[PDB]
């Protein structure tokens, strides 16, 4: 399974089957035939394989990179520190990319799950998506194929100078 808070799902509310007709639906017969002929043998084979897994259980880990000093507190043309800062920045760039991927998966799952009333019922997912795309665009857009932590720092400084001049000329 997965973590149900980073990939949230609302509570499923299915209606009780209230048949009005007198004809039997074939779907219940096919559901019982799928439970007998398919679901039980697949379940038995999976329980067999899972017992074989439990006979020898071993573990893998999520790699933890401790934070190194970023590109701002690295001296100019000091490759030993700005290399570490650049590797830190590239890992953060790949992780921010996957954060955007998570929020896109949330938006698409919300749209399909809500179905026809998706425009009303998915406003919070749309809002989180708009915020994370605005953040990703302010952070990493237009850097180029030769992007670096220096390029991103220069883009951030230009954006901060624009924000400072717009603030100061409004006061």
């Amino acid at each position: 399974s997965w973590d149900k808070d980073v990939y949230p799902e609302p509570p499923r509310r299915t209606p009780a089957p209230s048949p009005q007709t007198s004809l039997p639906n074939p779907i219940t017969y096919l559901t019982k035939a799928f439970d007998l002929l398919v679901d039980r043998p697949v379940t038995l084979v999976r329980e067999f394989i899972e017992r074989q897994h439990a006979k020898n259980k071993y573990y893998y880990y999520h790699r933890e990179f401790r934070r190194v000093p970023d590109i701002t507190e690295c001296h100019e043309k000091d490759v030993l520190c700005m290399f570490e800062a650049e590797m830190q920045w590239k890992r953060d760039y790949k992780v921010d990319q996957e954060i955007v991927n998570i929020i896109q998966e949330r938006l698409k799952a919300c749209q399909q799950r809500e179905g026809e009333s998706h425009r009303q019922n998915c406003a919070k997912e749309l809002q989180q998506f708009t915020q994370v795309v605005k953040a990703y665009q302010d952070r990493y857009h237009d850097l180029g194929a030769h992007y670096s932590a220096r390029k991103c720092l220069a883009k951030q400084k230009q954006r901060m100078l624009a924000e400072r001049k717009a603030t100061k000329e409004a006061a």
């Binding site: 043309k77 490759v79 030993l80």
Partner: protein, 63 residues
């Protein structure tokens, strides 16, 4: 290879190559200053050896 091994090997490569680059820039500046001023051990074009000069009393005194 491990990411540790490649990472720290890369840092050793970067230290060696940055030191070589700084020394090449210094080599250019040293050659420029020594050709300009002539007071270093390089570009020492020869002048006449003063061990060849005769210092005896000559035939005429005014010399």
């Amino acid at each position: 290879d491990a990411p540790e091994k490649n990472y720290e090997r890369t840092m050793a490569i970067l230290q060696i190559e940055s030191e070589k680059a700084e020394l090449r820039l210094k080599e250019l500046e040293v050659r420029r200053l020594m050709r300009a001023k002539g007071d270093g051990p390089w570009f020492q074009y020869p002048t006449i050896d003063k061990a060849l000069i005769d210092h005896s009393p000559k035939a005429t005194p005014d010399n």
